[PDB]
Design an enzyme around this catalytic site. Structure first.
Site, mmCIF file in Angstrom:
data_model
loop_
_atom_site.group_PDB
_atom_site.id
_atom_site.type_symbol
_atom_site.label_atom_id
_atom_site.label_comp_id
_atom_site.label_asym_id
_atom_site.label_seq_id
_atom_site.Cartn_x
_atom_site.Cartn_y
_atom_site.Cartn_z
ATOM 1 N N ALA A 97 4.013 -1.750 7.436
ATOM 2 C CA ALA A 97 5.003 -0.748 7.821
ATOM 3 C C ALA A 97 4.699 -0.285 9.242
ATOM 4 O O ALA A 97 3.559 -0.389 9.698
ATOM 5 C CB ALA A 97 4.955 0.420 6.846
ATOM 6 N N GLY B 154 2.319 -3.312 4.142
ATOM 7 C CA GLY B 154 3.742 -3.479 3.849
ATOM 8 C C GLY B 154 4.186 -4.923 3.912
ATOM 9 O O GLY B 154 5.139 -5.312 3.238
ATOM 10 N N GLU C 106 3.164 -6.179 0.629
ATOM 11 C CA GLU C 106 4.047 -5.602 -0.390
ATOM 12 C C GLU C 106 5.389 -6.296 -0.447
ATOM 13 O O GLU C 106 5.900 -6.568 -1.522
ATOM 14 C CB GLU C 106 4.246 -4.104 -0.168
ATOM 15 N N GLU D 179 -3.904 0.242 4.224
ATOM 16 C CA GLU D 179 -3.389 1.605 4.365
ATOM 17 C C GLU D 179 -4.476 2.693 4.371
ATOM 18 O O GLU D 179 -4.385 3.644 5.145
ATOM 19 C CB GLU D 179 -2.353 1.905 3.268
HETATM 20 MG MG LIG Z 1 2.352 0.565 4.202
#
Ligand SMILES: [Mg+2]
Ligand SMILES: C/C=C/C(=O)SCCNC(=O)CCNC(=O)[C@@H](O)C(C)(C)COP(=O)(O)OP(=O)(O)OC[C@H]1O[C@@H](n2cnc3c(N)ncnc32)[C@H](O)[C@@H]1OP(=O)(O)O
Ligand SMILES: C/C=C/C(=O)SCCNC(=O)CCNC(=O)[C@@H](O)C(C)(C)COP(=O)(O)OP(=O)(O)OC[C@H]1O[C@@H](n2cnc3c(N)ncnc32)[C@H](O)[C@@H]1OP(=O)(O)O
Ligand SMILES: [Mg+2]
Ligand SMILES: [Mg+2]
Ligand SMILES: [Mg+2]
EC number: 4.2.1.17
Lengths: 260, 260, 260, 260, 260, 260
Positions: free
Chosen positions: E68, E111, E114, E134
């Site tokens: 992310a 991310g 993920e 993270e």
């Molecule tokens: Mg993340």
């Protein structure tokens, strides 16, 4: 064919409803192994029958079923129980695809109560009485007495009933959601027939998807129950009866289902 | 935009309530694709409006919604349904973070009934009637009918309703927990707006967290629902409104929340 | 021992019931750490006491408990809460093997409502009032007010209570299944004790298994719950009391349970 | 009975293992009604035989079972499938309370693989191959093929196998934990019997509970599994074979289990 | 459209596969809101395109995605996150009915990992690395990184990866069952396309059901998952493609599927 | 305090790891009550110590824990296990909020193996062996060894180990996902301390949240697992350490976490 613990007969107009009367009043329809054996044979032949769509289950004016037969259980060991899977036969009622209405007059205690709760709908007589007195004789109820009750009625009432052995009335049973209609004693069986009759005049295949859809509400999360519902719903569009019933409404005429 | 099937309006004290009225009375508010299209637009406008704290949804005095538009389903195939994710659009209502109150006057049948159950709170009018009559047209409820109904009212009553298509009164639904308040036909909408006003006075973010925690009761075991609730609870303690709300109490004064 | 926030005495015939009365009336029995700390001490000694079969938990006539202590909560941060596992000590009540009955007179708001809901049975005085007003102080219920309430009372009423902070009468409570009996204010505690008395005369071991089974109804699917119930059911057959219960029945005499 | 699709015989020293060999080599032990019917009779017998402590299921050397009898499924309607529960009797493996061990030489495809996965323990030969190729003939797996495979192997490989119908070796299956041992083709059934023979040595009743406890892990949360396990772990103390097992250990000797 | 952050093209013999290539190399394909919007756009048009039967998602050789976008997350408060439903838009990939294959080269961190875990199948390049780092920027993974990872890999390795931020190799990941194939760096995407091609050969409707069944493994108990599987299995007997598929096998010829 | 069964002391960079060494080598670290009592005291201490960020648990080079202690168990009745809540005290490990790593050299059998599996991470020495031999003495595992094992390793191997009591190697355990590293015997404990050091240098509050998010993979559906993860993900945005981590990244510098 021939039955000595019960009375099974086809009823309704067009005989589309199968009625099963438990007929052992001397011991208030107490649920021995031979009695249950016969109800299962009875259920099987009504499940097998193409004309029959709904089954109605009852006992006498005084008792629906007083409970398990205690004189048999008395000498069982732990090993005897577990190895035999005691009360396996009692669950048969929950594996029938066609719906079953319990018409409960008078006493439904222990097994009898548990038998009514295994049914899809319960109609109660005015003087109907529901209890789980197992605790009084040193056991807990072992046929969904703890599970189905609590889900209907809520923790506080289920705990009270299961831990004290106390009875509740038909009026309270209705209020709590254990039963869904209260009828006079003389017309109870008949009113259950008329309901069974309404259900029987709908398509058998779709009715069975509906029943299955409502039982998933206790077996999975709402999200997944919604998904499963959508798939049974979509499935109905592969049936003839679904095109029949829907074009009937639009044409403003009476539908006619061929259970297909 | 400019609606053809509904009326969307701000109401309540300082226009803090979003009122959505289903306005297709010729068809008894039958939930065609075009109407849900607009309903969803209205829901999205009020979700995005910082003025609006709660949503009330209604129909006419005679009808909330009489069902899905059965004239649209008539010629659907099983393939048509599956690959169209048919009726998926109807679930936008379940994704709204602000509370939604259903104000049901008159008929809430089938789809209409399901729309009502997706809302957080239901108020019913004296002459309101609920039913899932899909079985009569050869389907099953395909939008949470079987799941939410059964969870609200218990097996017996949900089985009877879904299998026969029978209707229950406003008063039958209050007793069962399907609804939480009965009102005079004439004031239902105003009583609901008042409830929405109250909710709107509270902090939007802590309200959102409360609703999310309550909905979790149907997605989790109690043990984990209890763990989830604590995470939200502790989370409130990072908001300005929690500090203000508790300081208000300690200083014996009115709380003035700021959605933060 | 010498508690300052509560009174704890043995009641019932042969002192078979443990009574805990929350006694912080000047603060309407608000549940500060000290009070909960004493509550848990008292639960421990009753749980460890082989004479005691059941526990009755009550407050004053004006208030059962008006909530969690808001003054203690006021200056807590998010990091304080999470790391201190705030409210975790309240859960000790859900871990007691023996049955606990709440006897609610007056206010049971927020944490007080949650504390009641953690008990197995709730008995309400005619003027009892239940609420979850946390939202009015900018938090959400953090001890199962959104979990246990929803499961008892259904989504609609639960959403309305949690999102508005509104109160419901004892009568509403019973109707919704949050409570199982209403009594007059004057005699509530004595009628709660009488219920505890019945329970306590049953086998403490089988009673504990009974309770453990009913609580399972919220922690698993009905299929697995049924299997769990059977395992516990078969287990009773390894006890002395289960033989002594059934043999006492057959012979038509009083059963004499030795909690074994 | 004198079987025509399979061979069923007792094996090991003291003949304490049931062995079922699928004997339809011409069709590569493809599963038809006639074969399944007999497998189910053979399970019923070995489950009833008190000398049998464990079952081994196997095919030939080129094939365990190479899918189902697709010539039977070919004309079937949707209605025919649903009304007449299709592939219902293909499930009795999941209901045998004694341990079953799949010994897979060569192909285990479609139902073949599903049948193996339904067993507790899979031993695979060196040239054994697993696939769920139902997608290629326009269906999906319908005997837990998407369910047991995914939970053994994980989403990526399960998805790849199911959506393409591609095949994995014994070496891949072992890495992924679908099977738990790899053996030479010549000694595969021999290793399977030796493993079965150890299991047969233990207490039949206590083995049964250990099995039920492992199976629990796919049906409940970890929290409730642990509770269920504990309860079974307590149950063992009701049995003689545990008293006997532990006292034999402390007295430093071989134990004599009487399956009680 | 005119995508600035991605490249979308149809691939394979017969253009039956849709390739989506994340194309933000200056940021190592960090998943900013802009990039996800476009990813979601591309998924939709391939989902709607009737020629496309499977999708392949890749980044570049250096990076699938590095996580992310930490520059976008920097200044967000707790309030912003919760009210903006941050990362909710990432879930659209889990709503696609056609299969999606992640082809992971180089870095897949946080991310990135993920996103790949949301796809149905993962193919990894020889030099790919998986991580959930993270924790080293003071957050936890919030797009399924604690949930899918754990479910693929097991507690021990998940806990290790998430609590330390340490990375694993393609070989480690294949071993743990996070990815189902390892490919050379230079032919990974083509190899993935060839898996997609094979998936695209089969019926799109039955493939959608297949995928839906396998995903059910993570949302239900095994008992309910099997009943869902059975119902989907029956549903296939309502399609053209299942009769065609089965009649083509019996006749020993090539099936011609119509996605119907 | 002054331990007799264990050695507890701080280790690692700046004494931020808490090392519990089971120190009963001549009984192969059999898990008697005296030892579990002490273990628990040592957990409580390191859990309260703000210097400590992670915990490593070990035995000696020849044994982690050979299991429980049959002498204590030999005469226990069924009633005494249930009444006394037997092996309740063995669960405290599953309630520590800080991460626990097991460094398993040599035998980890039965209770020792369960004890390992209760930890978040398992590191194994090259000669480590895992087993659940309870079945050979007529019990089943009673501390989640049927539950954590099956979830980690898959059904086939779980059923094999529990039903036979057979050992698996360290290498087999890693292949199956039960342990995440294999180390040289002589350096095992130091490698586990290194892994603990890494964790201890991260934010304690975010570490704890992450561990919670991971533990939830075994307690709810993936849908609800994801929603719980998001709520924790957002909550990190209330912490100073999250801001510091992301800003460190943005300013190309080492994060300095403060546990806040
Ligand atoms: Mg993340
Ligand atoms: C009033 C306020 C503002 C101050 O808050 P307090 O919490 O310190 O005091 P209470 O509101 O709880 O008031 C005490 C007492 O005075 C009463 N009171 C206070 N102000 C008035 C007025 N204005 N009129 C009538 N009664 C009043 C109040 O209702 C109470 O009576 P009860 O209901 O029997 O406890
Ligand atoms: C709250 C309500 C509902 C009840 O209102 P009452 O007017 O009957 O009583 P008060 O709310 O005015 O409060 C009574 C007493 O208990 C205290 N109380 C009530 N609820 C709480 C809570 N939740 N926490 C701490 N203290 C509480 C309240 O502050 C008061 O103490 P003072 O500090 O002397 O004014
Ligand atoms: Mg509170
Ligand atoms: Mg109710
Ligand atoms: Mg694996």
């Amino acid at each position: 064919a021939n039955f000595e613990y019960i009375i099974a007969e086809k009823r309704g107009k067009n005989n589309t409803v199968g009625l099963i009367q438990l007929n052992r009043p001397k011991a208030l329809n107490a649920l021995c192994d031979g009695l249950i054996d016969e109800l299962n044979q009875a259920l099987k032949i009504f499940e097998e029958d193409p004309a029959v769509g709904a089954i109605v289950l009852t006992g006498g004016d005084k008792a629906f079923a007083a409970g398990a037969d205690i004189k048999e259980m008395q000498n069982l060991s732990f090993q005897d129980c577990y190895s035999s899977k005691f009360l396996k036969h009692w669950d048969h009622l929950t594996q029938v695809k066609k719906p079953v209405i319990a018409a409960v007059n008078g006493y439904a205690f222990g097994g009898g109560c548990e038998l009514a709760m295994m049914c899809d709908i319960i109609y109660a007589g005015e003087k109907a009485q529901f209890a789980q007195p197992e605790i009084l004789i040193g056991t807990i109820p072992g046929a969904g007495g703890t599970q189905r009750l609590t889900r209907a009625v809520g923790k506080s009432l289920a705990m009270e009933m299961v831990l004290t052995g106390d009875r509740i009335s038909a009026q309270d049973a209705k209020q709590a959601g254990l039963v869904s209609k209260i009828c006079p004693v003389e017309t109870l069986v008949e009113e259950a027939i008329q309901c069974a009759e309404k259900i029987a005049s709908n398509s058998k295949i779709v009715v069975a998807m509906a029943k299955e859809s409502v039982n998933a509400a206790f077996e999975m999360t709402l999200t997944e129950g919604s998904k499963l519902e959508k798939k049974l719903f979509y499935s109905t569009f592969a049936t003839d009866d679904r095109k029949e019933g829907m074009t009937a409404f639009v044409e403003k005429r009476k539908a006619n289902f061929k259970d297909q």
